[PDB]
Amino acid sequence: DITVYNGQHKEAATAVAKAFEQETGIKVTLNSGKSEQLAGQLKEEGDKTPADVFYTEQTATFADLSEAGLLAPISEQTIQQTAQKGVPLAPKKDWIALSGRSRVVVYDHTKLSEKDMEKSVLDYATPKWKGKIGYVSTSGAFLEQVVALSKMKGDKVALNWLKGLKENGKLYAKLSVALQAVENGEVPAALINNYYWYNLAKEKGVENLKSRLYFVRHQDPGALVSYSGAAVLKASKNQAEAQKFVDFLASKKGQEALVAARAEYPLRADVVSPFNLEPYEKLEAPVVSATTAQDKEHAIKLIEEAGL
Ligand SMILES: [Fe+3]
Ligand SMILES: [Fe+3]
Ligand SMILES: [Fe+3]
Ligand SMILES: [Fe+3]
């Protein structure tokens, strides 16, 4: 039996855990919380951690554990199972990217078509979208987007975009609220994450939705994907079962379990999502270095400078 510190969505972790125990007979105990909290706990606990695996929504959280010497090597053959072009790789081969979530533009297709959409996410922060583009400055993926813009285009472009949103955008408190505002006709478009639309479409039926998605693609900053993943703790005294769980997460069956529970893009090529997601490779996501705490702090300051 193993203990998994879980930063991923609980329903998703519960589903992959249940599929693991059904396939192997090895029981999984989840200890859930926020990834950066669990990461900090794993560093404090050090060689006395009870954690066998760290399962996360954000592979950026692994960098600090890796450089603190806290993560175990995993099999190169497992890592290759999800190593599509564009997928982040652990340089020390001590964690694995498993699935992703994408930034996207949702839009009311009864008011707009793909003709009205922009080539770059940068262009939505312009006077043509005055009063007409929703955004959610508070979510974690919004912060990652700012970090991505700074790294790919510099602080001046990132700040200009934030200022553009302040002036031209409509602020919503949560992503679900932005999505509903497009559906209900309050605003013709919003910047959101993919799974919100795919979840709504699964429950209500796409035929009953006014909104559709537009992916910028072309390695645009707006094509940003955030990656979920897993690591084995070096301090684990049950390496065989821990490695077995991570191998399972990268297997056809483990990926199937994940993609049914949550509308993340699988990173195995031979797995198809029931949420009707396009293949990861078609997103054409940019390659971006992992977010550090310092990147966050810098981005937070940009958001404040822009007036939010
Ligand atoms: Fe969120
Ligand atoms: Fe959230
Ligand atoms: Fe989210
Ligand atoms: Fe959310």
UniProtKB/Swiss-Prot annotation:
Task: Read off the InterPro entries from this record.
Answer: Ferric-bd (IPR026045), SBP (IPR006059), SBP_1_CS (IPR006061)
Q: Which residues bind Fe cation?
A: H9, E57, Y195, Y196
SUPFAM superfamilies referenced in this protein's UniProt entry, alphabetically: Periplasmic binding protein-like II (SSF53850)
Effect upon mutating I96V = In strain: TN106
- Localisation per UniProt entry: Periplasm
GO CC, sorted alphabetically, is: periplasmic space
**Example GO molecular function:** metal ion binding
Keyword Metal-binding present in the record's keywords: the answer is yes
Keywords assigned: Ion transport, Iron, Iron transport, Metal-binding, Periplasm, Signal, Transport
**Induction of synthesis:** By iron deprivation.
Quaternary structure annotation from Swiss-Prot or TrEMBL: The complex is composed of two ATP-binding proteins (FbpC), two transmembrane proteins (FbpB) and a solute-binding protein (FbpA).
Q: What does this protein do?
A: Part of the ABC transporter complex FbpABC (TC 3.A.1.10.1) involved in Fe(3+) ions import. This protein specifically binds Fe(3+) and is involved in its transmembrane transport.
Q: What is this protein called?
A: Iron-utilization periplasmic protein
In which organism is this protein found?
Answer: Haemophilus influenzae (strain ATCC 51907 / DSM 11121 / KW20 / Rd)
